[PDB]
Amino acid sequence: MKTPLTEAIAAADLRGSYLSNTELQAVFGRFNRARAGLEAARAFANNGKKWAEAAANHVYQKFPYTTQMQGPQYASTPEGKAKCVRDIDHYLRTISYCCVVGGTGPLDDYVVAGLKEFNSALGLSPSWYIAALEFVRDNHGLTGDVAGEANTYINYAINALS
Amino acid sequence: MKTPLTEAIAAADLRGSYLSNTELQAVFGRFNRARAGLEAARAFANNGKKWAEAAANHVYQKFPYTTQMQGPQYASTPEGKAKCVRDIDHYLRTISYCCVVGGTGPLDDYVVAGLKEFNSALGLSPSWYIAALEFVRDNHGLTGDVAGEANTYINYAINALS
Ligand SMILES: *[C@H](C)C1=C(C)C(=O)N[C@@H]1Cc1[nH]c(/C=C2N=C(/C=C3/NC(=O)C(CC)=C3C)C(C)=C\2CCC(=O)O)c(CCC(=O)O)c1C
Numbered sequence: 674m675k676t677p678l679t680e681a682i683a684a685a686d687l688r689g690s691y692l693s694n695t696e697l698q699a700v701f702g703r704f705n706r707a708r709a710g711l712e713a714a715r716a717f718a719n720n721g722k723k724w725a726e727a728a729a730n731h732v733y734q735k736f737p738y739t740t741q742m743q744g745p746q747y748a749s750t751p752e753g754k755a756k757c758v759r760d761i762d763h764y765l766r767t768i769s770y771c772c773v774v775g776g777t778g779p780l781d782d783y784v785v786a787g788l789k790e791f792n793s794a795l796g797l798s799p800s801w802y803i804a805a806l807e808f809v810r811d812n813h814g815l816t817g818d819v820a821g822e823a824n825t826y827i828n829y830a831i832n833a834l835s
Numbered sequence: 836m837k838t839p840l841t842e843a844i845a846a847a848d849l850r851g852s853y854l855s856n857t858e859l860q861a862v863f864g865r866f867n868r869a870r871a872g873l874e875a876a877r878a879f880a881n882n883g884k885k886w887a888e889a890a891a892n893h894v895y896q897k898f899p900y901t902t903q904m905q906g907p908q909y910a911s912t913p914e915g916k917a918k919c920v921r922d923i924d925h926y927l928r929t930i931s932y933c934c935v936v937g938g939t940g941p942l943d944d945y946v947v948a949g950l951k952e953f954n955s956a957l958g959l960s961p962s963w964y965i966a967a968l969e970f971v972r973d974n975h976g977l978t979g980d981v982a983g984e985a986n987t988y989i990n991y992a993i994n995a996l997s
Pocket residue numbers: 732733739740745746747748749752753754756757758760788789792795797798799801802805
């Protein structure tokens with residue numbers, strides 16, 4: 674998949690030239706955010722399970738039909754509910770990868786070139802996952818630079834599902 | 836193109852796990868090596884053509900026939916000599932990329948894949964290039980961890996060409 678480093682080398686290789694100082698300065702300056710993105714990667718790995726399970730609960734309360742209705746796409750069973758926390762934990766895992774990379778690549782390949790394609794042959798609602806992500810955005814308790822990265826990718830995923 | 840960061844994420848994404856404490860430690864301690872990777876890239880971007888000029892001349896001297904022989908693969912004309920400089924510059928350009936990334940990726944794609952399978956049809960000798968590569972190694976004037984990264988990758992190119 675793509676990262677801004679893989680993109681910058683790919684572009685400079687296509688025109689057969691070295692990376693100029695200005696292209697090389699945008700690699701020097703993204704090491705401030707990538708240091709912050711490594712604390713966010715270590716924060717997501719620490720509380721991800723509990724955040725995902727707490728996020729699942731909010732969705733169940735916000736959309737009570739999901740826990741009582743039919744059964745193919747609905748969390749009517751305790752097995753279906755387990756699958757919801759796993760689906761949510763997966764977003765949190767992909768968002769952590771984006772923070773380590775300093776780009777949207779991991780999400781671009783999971784949601785845009787992934788989820789938005791086959792959900793026509795599944796029928797789950799994006800709103801269930803936007804609410805889950807809004808809950809983890811407003812309840813993670815992260816600092817400043819660390820919060821910056823986590824909130825950039827959580828918000829990119831929310832909008833990718835739009 | 837493979838980078839050690841894109842293989843790290845790719846690997847954990849197949850297990851459906853967050854990057855562990857120690858997988859993140861192999862990314863953290865790379866900031867000293869990646870800083871040396873960007874200075875080495877700057878050095879190649881600055882003197883590259885001059886080194887490719889001095890390397891080409893050393894080749895015409897070790898192998899005097901490449902200057903006075905046949906015609907298809909030889910630098911027997913000033914148009915042929917200019918191509919030799921260009922092929923050497925390409926190596927130095929691909930080496931500069933590996934330095935920035937912190938992995939052999941750019942070289943694997945250029946030397947192993949492509950060059951070694953298509954040269955069977957072109958007939959050029961890997962020897963002339965190993966000899967131009969050893970000359971930029973022996974007298975680039977670089978020192979410290981910058982010479983380390985540069986020599987790691989210059990030695991990877993020489994290796995792959997065998
Ligand atoms: C969790 C928000 C949730 C609620 C509240 C609910 O009623 N159902 C649901 C849990 C659930 N998920 C599946 C199956 C899948 N979910 C997937 C992931 C998606 N994430 C999205 O944002 C989205 C819409 C764009 C998805 C489709 C996927 C890919 C699957 C199927 C493939 C798989 O992972 O196995 C189910 C039902 C099927 C099952 O239990 O496996 C439920 C109940």
